[PDB]
Design a protein around this ligand. Structure first.
Ligand SMILES: Nc1ncnc2c1ncn2[C@@H]1O[C@H](COP(=O)(O)OP(=O)(O)OP(=O)(O)O)[C@@H](O)[C@H]1O
Ligand SMILES: Nc1ncnc2c1ncn2[C@@H]1O[C@H](COP(=O)(O)OP(=O)(O)O)[C@@H](O)[C@H]1O
Ligand SMILES: [Mg+2]
Ligand SMILES: [Mg+2]
Lengths: 371, 389, 254, 227, 41, 647
């Protein structure tokens, strides 16, 4: 077949390659054998290799390396190193006696990277969400669809939306869709918060924003989820030395990172809030974030769906009617519904039964949903 | 035989690796192709390491045998002399002397220190945006092009008339009008050192660290022959100085004043041309706005009807639109809109087509996109505030 | 163009009146008040935030005022705004009486005061009256009536309702255990007592911490009487007996 | 900036010009004046089929010899129309004659900047007063700035720029009223967001003779068939 | 200013609300006043 | 059905051993003729090298417009069919075949994309942001490359005697032929300028102007025969001093024509032996270029006699490499047939054997993809002599493997390993072969490797790597590569012997301000151009020894590079040869390969109005179904008809 002949035209050149590689390896004069070269590398790299910063690169075979003690040795860089992955500020391995650049480092990631990355799939899924059909559709079109079927967008000739805002009152499924997207997506999920962006010293906020988005690029394809972005605003903290204006400069750094000079890689931004009126309109502009999607309080059908979802695992008593909860005609949220169910279970175990009852649900009403 | 062929291919790859070099990236090692051991042994046996110091003073600078006071950073200060391979004139009283160990004399003159943060600002990879990707701001493009490119491309037409071209521009306008887009276009089209700076990148935690890196940025630009600097989001540090009573913004005002003195002070600023991108050109200091520092202020006002039609054309060039476009109708239907709004309209038309599972975007899809991006999102618009700003 | 204006009567990015709703939540922080309708009469209970020991008793009421012969109101929120609103209510009722030679209907008086409320929420820069009213009255058109009006100038007719602290819990309880074509004054008083108990759980409903006013009809006249400490203590004792009996029955069943 | 009567550094009331911005959001009205009369054709933006098209009143009768085509904000338009009608009737009552189009337009325009802190903001409506008076047919354009000027052919509204470019390309001083209506409908159809169907446009004519006349559906259909 | 303790609670709770792989990390907080507690908490 | 068949047959032909490729091509051609897809049939016939079938299909074509577009395609490939005087529009078809009007079309594209403003060498150098005869030579070379085919400049079209005299020694020839290449592609009115220069008192200048005439006529075909006249008049009697300009100009001018008159004029000057070894080599080279792919017995025989006659030490001396090179160019792509020539060369001489044998073998198996042949080459590579045959062998792997999109990248990997494990000559040669395997095709591993090894200690490896990187960027002026070449100029500021190569790379990268391509293939990635591959192989085999050929006095081979200069064009024409500016979309390559999914769908849509200057690997299809294209593939000039079905 055509593909079989392609793979054969690959394997034959490969066999040619091993033939040549062997031939040369043996006619080498008992030297330069890959293992022999590696042993010579070990010999010339020294038994200890100090880790020091690379202050600047002057040219190939030369560089200024700052030792941990502060000395600034101008020293050669040997053929061993790739002469790549070397940028000012990088770690470098230095021969103990001559301080020659003989390796590079930073194979490990930072605690900030570890905390931001979500090295797990949240158990919540789109099936565990009831009522947010349009919001799910739009967030999928923004985050998942361009990753799973880029053919649609490439054929249509458009680029997918870069950002999405989930705006809604206190508890409507915004972080829930964030969890579902993290669960189902194949991209690296980086979670941050606005109060978590508000830093203490001057210049830490912008530095953290830059670090977060640099990590997102390094781990691209990535989804950066900034929950409660209005926390960078509404909330005021004394730890913040600069104050309102340092907050403004952090917001400006966010502006630049979302849409600035540097060309972004594959980093889709999700950003959630319940006070979207306090956000800077420049932050929300279409180039930085389009798809501002609302999360209204569930209607009667959606509330019924929430109760079905959150009671699917509870052994509701035959007399229990999951209809009086909905008939309670207040600003009931999905968070309220889940808390009512959870505290009903708590009273069930308190009063020793494994089956939840109407009285348990009513006292849960009166306890958590204080109305 | 397909699976046999893949198995053989991977076994062949494994053998090639096992006999050439496989995995050495943990300690940032290189593939063994460019391993010149014969040369590196002579390098380590013939090129001694040099500790970097600074020549503080030249005692007896006259032709008589001089002496140089070096200050090996954080190590010690010494009186030393030059290597016989180094000419006296190659070393001044401020150059990084670069002296060896062991009778610290084997000199190598060494350039000024640059903070890694500052030096990681040169635009190495040029943006993929061109001047043809910007529409509706023809005069702004012409003026910015003049200022930044034309002196750097054909200086003869300027020295013939004896003109000093304007050196400094302020691209100012509402959020999303082509400011950063035009900066990226300039960076792409320019053959010179382009250094991007972000206003938030000049906020540093220790007093005199913002001004320090402003000085380092400008002196690196000076070391380079032809440099364009681009302060984006200049609102961050550039703000009118106010006395207050609690010393607020003293540090940012100090770094701004350092930038002011570097742009126009008691010194020839050099062959540096500066761009200032902003959407709040009402906080900027009057000294910063003085035409000795921002010569060619340019306004990226919201595009008119022709500009909006041109932007729609630009953003729909590569789309799968149908026969009849009526992008002029779309432009009149979405007035006082930004290029960001227009690109979002085009994208939303494409997404409506995709959602309907069509491969052709039609005028109805575009009208739905306009309704979604211009009308429904009208409450999140930044123009009503930033036009006043 | 003023710097000090504060723009009291503007709309918000969303059609949500900030001053009116801040007044609403001031009502919420204020003391609790509730009203119950019943075929024989209407009643209005009210928590007291003047429970200090050195505080004298000089009026016949502190949360409850009389508007005219057959109508009373109760205020939640700000006491001074409540006083001015009650004075205006009395003026409106007496103007209607002077004009038509008959008592103002309850809905008409509520509508007049709510018109004043809406005028303050729309005109001028003055802050709205942070006061919520519960009116209980009688008139020859629909007999005993209960109304509840908010700072926004919105009023609604209720069979049983509550304003002030924990008003949401009180109204939920009334919804649970209020009977429409039943519940004469005796059961209405019992229900008000139990609602006040579960609304002021912090304190076990000391008779001095609440005030109850009952409006009824006798021989064609309307009588508005504030229940004395004796009667309030009797009602609290009866509720405590009933609660103890219910707890004993539940425990015995278990 | 803060306040309705603040001047911009360039010389600009800020509120007249925000009103101009508001005008650029309205339907497209086109007025032409010719020796044989004045034509006024205005797009009637019907958003739903359930909207009675006849209830969209963008062409109004100031008097028997003056009509007004409004664009921008129709309620402010209506206020100005009521003022114009009252002024014309007052002038007739006092002088026993008819307001000139220039006189009525200036009387209406003198009410355009009478706001402060009465009106709190300018009128966000642009008007085309097409009338016939002692000196023949005259079309006057007024804008929120209160500056009125009589034009041989004007096009206000969202499609103002393109409509007026086409009016340049087509209009000539020695044309007939029939061809003026023809060209106005062609331009209005070209700039129309939907198809021109004879129920989504208002056409009116003021001639040296018969009073201000608003074309019925039959005449509109005849002209639209002709185009 | 606002409460750093409440900030820390809110961030830790945001993590634990499904973004934590581990299952046995409980969060307890102590306060003197109930009303002043942040509406987010 | 049709798609399945044709696509599978094409792919298998590219990916199949020698014996089955011909049969698969026959059946592919049969299917195309059965379904009446005449342009496809013509493409298959040309790639088969079946001039008889080409004539049969072309004559069977009775549509005037389709025949004219076939004529355009065949002219771009390079062939001059001797059509009889009874066809559909004989004169128009013949002139289209001759490729005239190319000057007008190129100027029209320049005007549509304004590039007529001359760019002086200093403009591209941009020295204001970062010697002697060497710099003059480099500046003239880059000026010519950048202003090729425009007939416009600022150095020579203006006061030009100053530039000529600033150039020294062979710089005279350099400048004159640079002017020729500036006036390339049907500026035959420029015979006036080049004649009023060759009316000179200086031998170098006069011969360089003769070479300029030859190069201007290169690619061109004029029935007036504007080259043979000048070339014969100058080369008839003076066969003692230099003659290289004349012979080379004739060869470059005519190339694929294969005209017996020029063959029989070039053969005696080679066989006389009174002309220096340089002239003999250049004459064999010109014969090969004239007859790129013929199995021509006369050329083969004369080359064999020349090799036998030349002394042993003469064969040792360089410039003998061009005689087996000429023989290979003659036996270009003919495949196995060469066995007789291989045996003859084997019995000719022992040491010159390896060189001549490998050169002819690789130049005959160019594009075959014979894995066993490449294995023989790699065994020759493994056997280290303790070198010229080594270098030509590496060039041979490149030449034979530049046929498959997979084998090409794998040969790039093999070249990387060859440089890793190589010897001096092997490493010196690898950059040239790695340039051949990718020409005018920027690739971010080729560029990186060549840039890395430009700094290499070995000066000759640096020379070859820099020229190779310029080659890869040829006609594709790229910001990254231009900045890289400027950085290399800064690096080797002092080294003139290498800065000359850096400047040459800069100019060759900015070729024509960016209009052309030196890639041998064309159309849709499988159509070898014999003339172009001959020119490229000439230049690279000459560079195999870089110091004594290019850095010495033999850059007329750099000027022979022009044999591969063809444009990246998408001009569209009316049925009567008139411009038709039509919206056209562009992109690189996309599809779903299910069964035989065509890779014709393009996703990088970029609407343009013809003329369009498409890049390497981009397919441009029509914007709307208003015009039908007679050619299934839109490359080069096209004739578009009005779709009678519906606009
Ligand atoms: N005039 C324009 N022509 C084409 N595209 C435009 C134009 N204006 C904006 N855009 C689109 O919007 C984005 C460019 O916005 P840009 O980053 O330059 O905004 P800005 O004016 O710097 O605003 P900000 O204040 O938010 O930093 C790109 O998506 C570009 O496609
Ligand atoms: N369909 C739903 N709508 C709203 N909330 C839901 C739904 N399904 C589950 N929840 C519950 O809501 C909580 C998430 O609320 P969240 O979106 O974080 O609100 P916010 O982000 O505004 O604080 C989860 O604890 C989840 O169990
Ligand atoms: Mg949340
Ligand atoms: Mg920007």
């Amino acid at each position: 077949r055509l593909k079989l002949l392609k793979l054969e035209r690959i394997k034959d050149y490969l066999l040619m390659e091993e033939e040549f590689i062997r031939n040369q390896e043996q006619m080498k004069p008992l030297e330069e054998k890959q293992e022999e070269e590696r042993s010579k590398v070990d010999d010339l790299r020294g038994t200890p290799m100090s880790v020091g910063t690379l202050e600047e690169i002057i040219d190939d075979n030369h560089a200024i390396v700052s030792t941990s003690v502060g000395s600034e040795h101008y020293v050669s860089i040997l053929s061993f190193v790739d002469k790549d992955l070397l940028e000012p500020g990088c770690s470098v391995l230095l021969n103990h006696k001559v301080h020659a650049v003989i390796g590079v480092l930073m194979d490990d990631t930072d605690p900030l990277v570890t905390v931001m990355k979500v090295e797990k799939a949240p158990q919540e899924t789109y099936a565990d969400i009831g009522g947010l059909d349009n919001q799910i559709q739009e967030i999928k079109e923004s985050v998942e669809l361009p990753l799973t079927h880029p053919e649609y967008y490439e054929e249509m000739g458009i680029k997918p939306p870069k950002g999405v805002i989930l705006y809604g009152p206190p508890g409507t499924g915004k972080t829930l869709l964030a969890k579902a997207v993290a669960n189902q997506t194949s991209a690296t999920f980086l979670r941050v918060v606005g109060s978590e962006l508000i830093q203490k010293y001057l210049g830490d906020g912008p530095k953290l924003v830059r670090e977060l988005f640099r990590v997102a690029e390094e781990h691209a394809p990535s989804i950066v989820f900034i929950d409660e972005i209005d926390a960078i605003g509404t909330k005021r903290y004394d730890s913040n030395s600069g104050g309102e204006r340092e907050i403004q400069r952090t917001m400006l750094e966010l502006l630049n990172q979302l849409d600035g000079f540097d060309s972004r890689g594959d980093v889709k931004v999700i950003m959630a809030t319940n006070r979207i009126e306090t956000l800077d309109p420049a932050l929300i502009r279409p180039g930085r974030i389009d798809r501002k999607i609302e999360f209204p309080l569930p209607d009667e059908k959606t509330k019924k769906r929430i109760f079905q979802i959150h009671t699917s695992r509870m052994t509701l008593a035959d007399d229990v009617t999951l209809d009086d909860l909905i008939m309670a005609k207040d600003d009931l949220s999905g968070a309220d519904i889940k808390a009512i169910c959870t505290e009903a279970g708590l009273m069930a175990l308190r009063e020793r039964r494994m089956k939840v009852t109407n009285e348990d649900f009513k006292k849960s009403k009166e306890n958590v949903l204080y109305k | 035989q397909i699976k046999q062929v893949e198995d053989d291919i991977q076994q062949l790859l494994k053998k090639i690796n096992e006999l050439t070099g496989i995995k050495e990236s943990d300690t940032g090692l290189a593939p063994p192709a460019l391993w010149d051991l014969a040369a590196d042994k002579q390098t380590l046996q013939s090129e001694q390491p040099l500790q970097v110091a600074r020549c503080t003073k030249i005692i007896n600078a006259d032709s008589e045998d001089p002496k140089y006071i070096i200050n090996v950073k954080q190590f010690a200060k010494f009186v030393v002399d030059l290597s016989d391979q180094v000419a006296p004139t190659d070393i001044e009283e401020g150059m990084r002397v670069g002296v060896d160990r062991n009778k610290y004399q084997i000199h190598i003159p060494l350039p000024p220190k640059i903070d890694p943060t500052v030096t990681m600002m040169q635009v190495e990879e040029k943006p993929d945006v061109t001047y043809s990707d910007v529409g509706g701001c023809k005069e702004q493009i012409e003026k910015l092009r003049e200022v930044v490119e034309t002196p750097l491309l054909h200086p003869e037409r300027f020295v013939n008339l004896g003109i000093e071209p304007p050196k400094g521009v302020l691209l100012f306008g509402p959020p999303g009008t082509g400011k950063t887009l035009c900066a990226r276009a300039v960076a792409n089209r320019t053959d010179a050192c382009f250094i991007r700076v972000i206003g938030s990148e000049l906020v540093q935690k220790y007093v005199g660290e913002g001004a320090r890196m402003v000085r380092e940025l400008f002196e690196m630009a000076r070391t380079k022959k032809a440099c364009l600097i681009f302060f984006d989001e200049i609102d961050a540090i550039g703000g009118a100085r106010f006395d207050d009573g609690a010393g607020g913004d003293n540090e940012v005002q100090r770094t701004m004043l350092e930038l002011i003195n570097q742009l126009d002070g008691f010194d020839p600023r050099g062959n540096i041309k500066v761009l200032m991108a902003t959407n709040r050109p009402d906080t900027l200091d009057p000294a910063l706005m003085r035409p000795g520092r921002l010569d060619r202020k340019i306004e990226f006002s919201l595009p008119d009807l022709e500009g909006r039609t041109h932007i729609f054309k630009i953003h729909a060039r590569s789309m799968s639109v149908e026969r009849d476009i009526r992008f002029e109708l779309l432009a009149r239907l979405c007035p006082n809109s930004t290029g960001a709004e227009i690109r979002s309209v085009c994208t939303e038309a494409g997404m409506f087509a995709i959602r309907a599972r069509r491969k052709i975007a039609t005028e109805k899809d575009f009208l739905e996109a306009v309704n979604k991006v211009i009308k429904s999102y009208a409450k999140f618009s930044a123009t009503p505030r930033y036009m006043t700003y | 163009s003023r710097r000090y204006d504060s723009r009291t009567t503007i709309f918000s990015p969303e059609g949500r009146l900030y001053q009116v709703e801040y007044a609403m939540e001031a009502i919420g922080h204020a003391g609790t008040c509730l009203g119950i309708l019943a075929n024989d009469g209407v009643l209005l209970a009210a928590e007291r935030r003047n429970i200090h020991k050195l505080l004298d008793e000089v009026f016949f009421s502190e949360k409850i005022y009389k508007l005219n012969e057959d109508m009373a109101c109760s205020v939640a929120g700000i006491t001074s705004d409540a006083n001015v609103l009650t004075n205006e209510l009395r003026l409106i009722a007496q103007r209607y009486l002077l004009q038509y030679q008959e008592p103002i209907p309850c809905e008409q008086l509520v509508t007049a005061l709510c018109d004043i409320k809406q005028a303050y929420t729309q005109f001028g820069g003055k802050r709205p009256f942070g006061v919520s009213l519960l009116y209980i009255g009688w008139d020859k058109h629909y007999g005993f009536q209960l109304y509840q009006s908010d700072p926004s100038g919105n009023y609604g007719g209720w069979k049983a309702t509550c304003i002030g602290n924990n008003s949401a819990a009180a109204v939920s309880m009334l919804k649970q255990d209020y009977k429409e074509g039943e519940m004469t004054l005796k059961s209405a008083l019992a229900l008000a007592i139990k609602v006040l108990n579960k609304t002021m759980d912090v304190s076990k409903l000391s008779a001095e911490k609440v005030e109850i006013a009952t409006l009824t009809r006798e021989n064609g006249k309307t009588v508005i009487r504030v229940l004395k400490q004796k009667e309030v203590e009797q009602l609290i004792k009866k509720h405590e007996e009933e609660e103890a009996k219910a707890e004993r029955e539940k425990k015995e069943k278990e | 900036d803060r306040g309705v009567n603040t001047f911009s550094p360039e010389g600009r009331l800020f509120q007249v010009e925000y009103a101009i911005e508001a005008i650029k959001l309205g339907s497209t009205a086109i007025g032409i004046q010719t020796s044989e009369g004045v034509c006024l054709a205005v797009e009637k933006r019907i958003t739903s089929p359930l909207m009675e098209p006849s209830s969209i009143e963008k062409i109004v009768e100031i008097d028997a010899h003056i009509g007004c085509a409004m664009s921008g904000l129709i309620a402010d338009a209506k206020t100005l129309i009521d003022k114009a009608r009252v002024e014309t009737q007052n002038h007739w009552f006092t002088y026993n004659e008819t307001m000139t189009v220039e006189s009525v337009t200036q009387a209406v325009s003198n009410l355009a900047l009478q706001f402060g802190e009465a009106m709190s903001r300018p009128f966000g409506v642009a008007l085309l007063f097409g009338g016939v008076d002692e000196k023949g047919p005259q079309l006057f354009h007024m804008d929120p700035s209160g500056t009125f000027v009589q034009c041989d052919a004007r096009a206000i509204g969202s499609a103002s720029e393109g409509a007026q470019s086409s009016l340049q390309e087509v209009y000539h001083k020695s044309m007939t009223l029939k061809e003026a209506i023809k060209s106005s409908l062609i331009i209005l159809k070209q700039v129309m967001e939907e198809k021109l169907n004879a129920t989504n446009i208002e056409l009116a004519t003021v001639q040296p003779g018969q009073n201000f006349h608003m074309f019925t559906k039959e005449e509109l259909e005849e002209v639209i068939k002709d185009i | 200013g606002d409460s750093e303790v409440q900030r820390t609670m809110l961030e830790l709770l945001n993590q634990l609300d499904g973004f934590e792989a581990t299952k046995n990390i409980k969060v307890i907080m102590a306060t003197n006043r109930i009303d002043i507690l942040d509406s987010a908490l | 059905a049709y798609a399945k068949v044709c696509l599978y047959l094409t792919s298998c032909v590219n990916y199949v051993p020698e014996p089955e490729n011909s049969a698969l091509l026959r059946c592919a051609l049969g299917v195309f003729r059965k379904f009446s897809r005449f342009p496809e049939a013509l493409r298959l016939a040309l790639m088969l090298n079946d001039m008889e079938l080409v004539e049969d299909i072309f004559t069977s074509c009775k549509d005037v417009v389709v025949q004219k577009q076939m004529a355009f395609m065949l002219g771009r490939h390079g062939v001059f069919l001797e059509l009889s005087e009874d066809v559909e529009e004989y004169e128009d078809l013949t002139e289209i075949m001759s490729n005239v009007q190319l000057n007008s079309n190129f100027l029209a594209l320049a005007r549509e994309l304004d590039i007529m403003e001359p760019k002086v060498p200093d403009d591209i150098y941009k020295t204001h942001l970062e010697d002697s005869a060497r710099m003059n030579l480099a500046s003239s070379f880059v000026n010519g490359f950048v202003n090729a085919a425009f007939g416009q400049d600022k150095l020579l079209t203006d006061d030009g005697n100053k530039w000529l005299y600033k150039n020294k020694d062979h710089g005279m020839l350099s400048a004159a032929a640079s002017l020729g290449m500036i006036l390339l592609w049907d500026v035959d009115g420029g015979l006036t300028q080049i004649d009023k220069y060759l009316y000179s008192s200086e031998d170098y200048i006069k011969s360089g102007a003769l070479l300029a005439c030859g190069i201007v006529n290169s690619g061109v075909r004029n029935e007036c025969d504007p080259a043979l006249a000048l070339l014969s008049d100058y080369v008839l009697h003076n066969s003692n001093t230099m003659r290289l300009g004349s012979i080379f100009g004739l060869g470059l001018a005519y190339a694929g024509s294969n005209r017996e008159d020029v063959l029989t004029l070039l053969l005696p000057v080679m066989g006389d032996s009174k002309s220096s070894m340089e002239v003999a080599g250049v004459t064999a080279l010109a014969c090969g270029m004239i007859a790129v792919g013929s199995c021509n017995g006369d050329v083969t025989s004369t080359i064999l006699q020349t090799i036998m006659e030349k002394s042993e030490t003469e064969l040792k001396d360089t410039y003998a490499r061009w005689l087996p090179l000429g023989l290979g160019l003659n036996h270009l792509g003919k495949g196995e047939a060469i066995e007789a020539i291989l045996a003859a060369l084997e019995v000719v001489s022992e040491p010159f054997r390896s060189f001549a044998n490998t050169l002819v073998d690789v130049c005959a198996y160019a594009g075959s993809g014979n894995v066993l042949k490449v294995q023989q080459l790699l065994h020759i590579c493994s056997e280290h002599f303790d070198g010229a045959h080594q270098g030509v062998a590496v060039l041979g792997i490149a030449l034979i493997a530049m046929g498959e999109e997979i084998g090409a990248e794998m040969a790039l990997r093999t070249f990387g390993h060859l440089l890793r494990y190589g010897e001096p000559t092997l490493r010196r040669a690898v950059p040239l072969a790695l340039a051949l395997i990718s020409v005018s095709n920027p690739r971010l591993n080729i560029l990186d490797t060549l840039s890395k090894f430009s700094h290499d200690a070995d000066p000759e490896v640096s020379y070859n790597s820099i020229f190779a990187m310029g080659m890869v960027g040829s006609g594709t002026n790229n910001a990254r590569l231009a900045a890289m070449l400027r950085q290399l100029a800064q690096y080797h500021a002092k080294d003139p012997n290498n800065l000359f190569m850096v400047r040459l790379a800069q100019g060759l990268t900015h070729l024509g301000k960016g209009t052309l391509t030196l890639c041998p293939y064309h159309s849709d990635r499988q159509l070898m151009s014999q003339v172009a591959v001959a020119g490229l192989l000439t230049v690279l085999v000459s560079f195999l020894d870089v110091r004594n050929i290019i850095l010495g006095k033999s850059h007329y081979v750099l000027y022979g590079l022009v044999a591969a200069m063809q444009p990246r064009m998408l001009v569209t024409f009316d049925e009567e040869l008139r411009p038709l500016p039509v919206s056209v979309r562009v992109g690189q390559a996309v599809d779903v390969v299910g069964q035989a999914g065509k890779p014709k769908t393009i996703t990088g849509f970029q609407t343009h109005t013809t003329p369009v200057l498409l890049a390497h690997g981009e397919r441009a299809e029509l914007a709307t179904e208003e015009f039908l294209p007679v050619t299934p593939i839109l490359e080069g000039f096209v004739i578009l008809r009005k779709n009678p079905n519906y606009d």
